[PDB]
Each structure stands twice: as structure tokens, then as C-alpha cells.
Amino acid sequence: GAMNSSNYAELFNNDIKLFVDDTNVYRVTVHKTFEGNVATKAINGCIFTLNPKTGHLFLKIIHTSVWAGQKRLSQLAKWKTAEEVSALVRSLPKEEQPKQIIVTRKAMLDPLEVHMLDFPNIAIRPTELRLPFSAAMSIDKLSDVVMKATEPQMVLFNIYDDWLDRISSYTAFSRLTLLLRALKTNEESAKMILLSDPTITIKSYHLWPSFTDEQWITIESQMRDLILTEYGRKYNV
Amino acid sequence: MNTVPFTSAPIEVTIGIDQYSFNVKENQPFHGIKDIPIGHVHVIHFQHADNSSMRYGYWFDCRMGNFYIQYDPKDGLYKMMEERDGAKFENIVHNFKERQMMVSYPKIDEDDTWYNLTEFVQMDKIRKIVRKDENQFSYVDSSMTTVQENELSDPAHSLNYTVINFKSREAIRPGHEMEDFLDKSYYLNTVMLQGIFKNSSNYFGELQFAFLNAMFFGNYGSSLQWHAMIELICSSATVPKHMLDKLDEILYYQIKTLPEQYSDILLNERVWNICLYSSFQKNSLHNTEKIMENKYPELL
Numbered sequence A: 001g002a003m004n005s006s007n008y009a010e011l012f013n014n015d016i017k018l019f020v021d022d023t024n025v026y027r028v029t030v031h032k033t034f035e036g037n038v039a040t041k042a043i044n045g046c047i048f049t050l051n052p053k054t055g056h057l058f059l060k061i062i063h064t065s066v067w068a069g070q071k072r073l074s075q076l077a078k079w080k081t082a083e084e085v086s087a088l089v090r091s092l093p094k095e096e097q098p099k100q101i102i103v104t105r106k107a108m109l110d111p112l113e114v115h116m117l118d119f120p121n122i123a124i125r126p127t128e129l130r131l132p133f134s135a136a137m138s139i140d141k142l143s144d145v146v147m148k149a150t151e152p153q154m155v156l157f158n159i160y161d162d163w164l165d166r167i168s169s170y171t172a173f174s175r176l177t178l179l180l181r182a183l184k185t186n187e188e189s190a191k192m193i194l195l196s197d198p199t200i201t202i203k204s205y206h207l208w209p210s211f212t213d214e215q216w217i218t219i220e221s222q223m224r225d226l227i228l229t230e231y232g233r234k235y236n237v
Numbered sequence B: 001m002n003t004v005p006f007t008s009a010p011i012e013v014t015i016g017i018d019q020y021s022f023n024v025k026e027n028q029p030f031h032g033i034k035d036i037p038i039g040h041v042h043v044i045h046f047q048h049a050d051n052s053s054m055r056y057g058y059w060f061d062c063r064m065g066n067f068y069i070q071y072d073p074k075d076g077l078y079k080m081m082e083e084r085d086g087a088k089f090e091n092i093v094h095n096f097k098e099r100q101m102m103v104s105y106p107k108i109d110e111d112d113t114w115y116n117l118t119e120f121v122q123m124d125k126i127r128k129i130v131r132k133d134e135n136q137f138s139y140v141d142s143s144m145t146t147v148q149e150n151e152l153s154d155p156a157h158s159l160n161y162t163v164i165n166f167k168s169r170e171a172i173r174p175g176h177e178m179e180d181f182l183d184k185s186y187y188l189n190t191v192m193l194q195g196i197f198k199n200s201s202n203y204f205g206e207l208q209f210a211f212l213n214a215m216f217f218g219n220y221g222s223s224l225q226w227h228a229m230i231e232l233i234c235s236s237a238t239v240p241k242h243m244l245d246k247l248d249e250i251l252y253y254q255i256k257t258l259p260e261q262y263s264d265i266l267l268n269e270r271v272w273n274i275c276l277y278s279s280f281q282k283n284s285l286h287n288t289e290k291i292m293e294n295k296y297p298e299l300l
């Protein structure tokens, strides 16, 4: 069934599962042609395939060449996603394959169901949560590796850095989504919050700054304030 | 012209023959149906006055034997049976005809509806969907489930229609996932037509038979099968020209014949709107689209 507020803890149990977000797979800039018409130019994208328990992120970079000569790119994009997720599961050892794959957008269900016919015991599920994974390209290190890619490429990251050494997966996922929700609502402000203090650095092998527990609490508060504000600034409240 | 005598009519029942029906009262002196046209299959069907639940009936073809109906008070239904003694049968029929205890298959001569609804339906194929090889005729009722329905519980009473499943390895070639899912021509032409059905006549015959069980018995799995066979064709970019023209004619006579008051449950909005307005064949079904719009524009 679908994933929602009521079965939220199931993300952190011991059954392997992955989220797939496809929002950033097909990305374009829209521009004007000399004749005054409009054209898109594709830029590199990615699939965002995430273990919410362990933080393991399978970042599949979608190089603009995959679109060359193809029609109906937004529809092709869902099937390419499904194709690349299925290839990923097949590459994993049996004991690492998921038991469930949760798609953040219902339009992926049929494309992934069809690609995964060989895996009848892997449940493909939608979700009712409005997850902010589109904002993954607001994470500078991830954005950098996507734009720089000159061929198709899988990159591996832990999106929790080292947080699980100190906090539980439930708490690591809540932090991640708060950060990503802030980055999505006001990227400039969110990034200002994260880097304001020059003395807090990002490890070479991390995505986020090395905050102490006390500083994470301050950071988390500041991100909540931002999201409430923007909800005011937007709705005037 | 052939005849299906009835031993008697001990319970009040609405009797159908093909698209015709008549009411028979309890112990009314009714003894069967004559002038049935040779060369087509037929279906005789029953709805008891007391339990409108369970519509049931018998697919038969008079060229294959002498058949009659006799009520069974133990099993509580009108049963079809075969009389092997040809002289006993002619003798019974002639006496009933002489006493004019029979209704006449009331075929208007201008009317080709029955031919047009059973054009490709053949008893030999019916008997493979409805498995009961000791009889030359086939019992169907409202509640019989399909092979496919059972998969998702008594096999001896199943309707063994051809399983069609758009999200199945049969339907989807490895490496062509999106091609085959969005354009089912492979599944139609290679898998189903060339592979399973052998030709389009057998395909259309199962499709027409499924429609008829849906309409006459409210058989829900039949209705699912009829719509699935339509959708497979509508969702194939590449369909022989003769098949599309015949499909249009087939579906036209099915929509024409449907009771106007049953269109809510026998017609699947999604399939029809897709087939008439969104599918590859959205422009290839003129007669069907014309009658659907003038008769059931609400569904659309």
C-alpha cells in the first residue's frame, strides 16, 4: 500500500527499502531562439535512490547524451529511471536487494512495476508524503558531481554523513527532510544558515557541516523558523 | 429449422433464447422452442421468478445433436440434456408442434443481429473455455469465475478464457519495457494472434463470447475479459486493417444490443474513453464511436 503519516516508522525497520525520486532526472533550461521561439537545452540530471535506514544514496547521474534524438523526454525520463533502478537492484547481491521500493511520484509506479517484473517479491509503493527530495540538487557536493559528469556515472554517498554514530535513523531522516524542506522553500536563506559560522567546516568526505549536537539543535530551530516564515511571506500570516 | 422441446415448466421462469425472452408461469403448458436457425450457436437462459439471483443457461448448436430442457426438482434448475434416440425425439417434437405448445424463434427476416453478435463464435471453442466434455452443450451462469480471477476457487466450474495481463512477462519483452507497455502490438500480433489464438477469427470469437456471457448472465469476469480484449487491440499501434474494420462492426452491434439500463455496470469508462479518444485506434472505430456518443454520451 501507500506510505503516509500512519505507517511512518516502517521506514526504519530492518526490511531493506529504497526511496526513488525522479524529479531531477530530466532537467532543462528554457530559452529563446534567434527567430524568437522557445527551446529547451537539457542539462545533466540524476536519480535519487536512497536507503532511509542507512543513509546510503545511489546517485545515478543522467548525462544529457541519453536524451539525444529521443521524443517525449518527460515520459522517457520515467522509464529511464525505472530502467536504472532495476539495473541497480540487479547489480546488488541478493541479501542487499530491497524488499520494497517507494516512489515519491505516482507516475513512476507503472514504469518501475514493468521494469521489475523479474522481481515479483519486491513491493513497489507510492507515498502520500510530500517529501522534499527535489532539493537534493541544492546540496553543493551533489550538484557539483552531476554538472561535471561527462558520461553516465553512479556516485555513492552517505546522505547522513556520520550522524548515525550519535542519533537514530528516525532522527537522521527527520533532520534530512527538514534541511531539504528548508533548501526547497528558500535556498539562499537555508544555505546562509548552514555556512554562516566560518569555523564549522564540512569534512572532505561529508555533505553537511560538522555540527556538534548543541549546534544541530540551533541549526534545526533556524530551519523551522525559515519554513514557518516563508509560509507567512507566502500566505501573509 | 431445429427445435428444443421442454419436458414441462414446473416453476415460473423468464426464458431467454439469444436476444429474445418470454415469461412462463408456474405449470403453464409450455413445451419448448421451434424454428431455431441452423448455422449459428445459441444460448437458452433462465431467470427464476422467485430468485432473480443466478441467471443461467446453455450454449448449444443444433447441428451437434438433439437437445431438450427438463426441470430438475432436486438441483432446482432447468437442465439441458441430449436425446440420443432420434425417433423418440422427432416423435416428441412433432406431437408438441401439432398441439402448438411451442414458441417460435421469432426472427425478423431483415434482422442480422444474432449473426452479427456470434459471427466468430464456434461451439468447439466455447467447449474449451467451458470445460465439461461429456456434454455437447455448455452451462454458464452469473457467478462462474474466470481462470484469471481464481489466480488473484473451484477449477471444474471456471471460465477458461485466455489470460491477458498488460504488466506480465508475457506482455513485456525484456529490453523493450517501455516500447511494449505503451504500444502492445507485439503482445497482440506475435503473442496472442500468431502464438495463442492462431488467427483473428478465434480472437474475435472469444471476445464476442465474453461479451455475450457478460450481457446475458451479468458474468463479471466475462465483462473484464471482453474489455481486456478490446483494450489490447486499441492499444496496439499496428493492427491489420481488416481486424480494425471488423472490430468496429463487432463492437457496434454489441453496444447496439446492450440494455440501455445496464450501461452503468457493463461498460468500463476508462477502457472506452481510452479506446475511442486516446488510443492509437481513436480514429478507426467510426461506427462504434458514433453509436456510443448518441446512446451513452454520459459515460464519456
Ligand SMILES: CC(=O)N1CCCCC[C@H]1c1ccco1
Pocket: A056, A057, A058, A156, A157, A158
Ligand atoms: C558504506 C560505503 O562504503 N559506501 C560507499 C562509499 C560512500 C559511503 C556510502 C556507502 C554506500 C553508498 C551506497 C552504497 O554504499
